[PDB]
Amino acid sequence: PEFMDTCFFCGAVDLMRYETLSAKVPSSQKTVSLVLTHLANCIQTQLDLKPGARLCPRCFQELSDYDTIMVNLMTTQKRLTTQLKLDK
Amino acid sequence: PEFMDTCFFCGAVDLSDSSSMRYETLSAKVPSSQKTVSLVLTHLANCIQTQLDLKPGARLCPRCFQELSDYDTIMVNLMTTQKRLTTQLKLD
Ligand SMILES: [Zn+2]
Ligand SMILES: [Zn+2]
Ligand SMILES: [Zn+2]
Ligand SMILES: [Zn+2]
């Protein structure tokens, strides 16, 4: 029977299901492909995303959580800067 | 005392004699990073290409100090999460 899954960001569960790169991270609702091209960019490289690529649930969560931190950083930054601009 | 402290960031005044956890100098360290809360503010001024006169007896209400403390805490969870996942990407 067993057809078998492999994380593009680490390794192998004969599969808590594995995600395509078009899967959306929840906080921004942008594709998890876009979060991977963000991290590639943070270290001055290209990535090649085959239409094969899947993600373990662990990695999908890691990437989700990063995007989530990145959102709640950008929003609390605006709350605080717009406060700085204000009077009394 | 007679004790009248004014918040640099919201303008709340507190009038004392007093209380528990109360107003903070701009040298008070933010917990999860230990930059001085003046640095956190100089950072926020940069973000809107302005800068600030931190006049030398300035003060912060707890709530504002909490709020800057937590921004600092988020930025640190960005610093460390990002070292991890890019390092992960380098493995191939
Ligand atoms: Zn596909
Ligand atoms: Zn994985
Ligand atoms: Zn305040
Ligand atoms: Zn002082």
Side-chain angles (χ1 to χ4, degrees), chain A residues 1 3-14 16 18-88, chain B residues 1-2 4-19 22-34 36-54 56-82 84-92:
Chain A
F3 293 178
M4 46 275 286
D5 278 308
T6 296
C7 194
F8 146 107
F9 211 62
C10 43
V13 175
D14 271 38
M16 223 65 192
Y18 278 36
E19 297 275 14
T20 56
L21 302 182
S22 55
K24 289 151 67 138
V25 285
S27 304
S28 66
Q29 296 279 305
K30 310 167 157 302
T31 50
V32 73
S33 47
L34 221 200
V35 187
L36 287 165
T37 16
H38 174 76
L39 296 177
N41 288 354
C42 298
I43 63 186
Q44 320 287 85
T45 41
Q46 229 95 137
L47 270 174
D48 190 59
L49 302 177
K50 293 71 54 198
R54 301 273 168 287
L55 280 174
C56 65
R58 189 188 59 71
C59 290
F60 185 68
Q61 180 56 53
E62 280 288 60
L63 286 176
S64 284
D65 285 350
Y66 179 80
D67 156 74
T68 296
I69 296 151
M70 173 61 82
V71 167
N72 91 242
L73 191 281
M74 285 320 303
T75 85
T76 112
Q77 198 193 92
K78 181 152 262 297
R79 173 157 36 73
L80 289 186
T81 61
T82 73
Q83 177 59 22
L84 202 45
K85 302 202 328 299
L86 258 37
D87 189 3
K88 297 213 222 158
Chain B
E2 226 215 11
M4 176 198 188
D5 275 326
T6 289
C7 183
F8 167 92
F9 190 72
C10 73
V13 326
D14 176 41
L15 302 156
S16 277
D17 172 33
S18 297
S19 3
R22 282 270 60 148
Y23 279 56
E24 297 283 343
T25 70
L26 296 195
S27 304
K29 280 162 173 150
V30 290
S32 57
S33 128
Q34 307 274 303
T36 211
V37 68
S38 50
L39 288 172
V40 180
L41 293 166
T42 44
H43 167 38
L44 288 167
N46 292 327
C47 290
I48 57 151
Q49 34 271 345
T50 84
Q51 75 300 76
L52 315 156
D53 184 55
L54 294 191
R59 220 105 305 178
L60 282 171
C61 76
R63 180 267 326 267
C64 287
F65 181 65
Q66 184 51 42
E67 214 126 341
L68 300 156
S69 283
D70 300 337
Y71 172 71
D72 166 80
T73 318
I74 299 152
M75 176 85 70
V76 164
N77 283 77
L78 214 273
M79 262 126 181
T80 70
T81 308
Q82 198 185 79
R84 184 188 333 123
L85 297 184
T86 58
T87 309
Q88 186 67 60
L89 252 181
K90 300 260 255 309
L91 302 197
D92 308 340

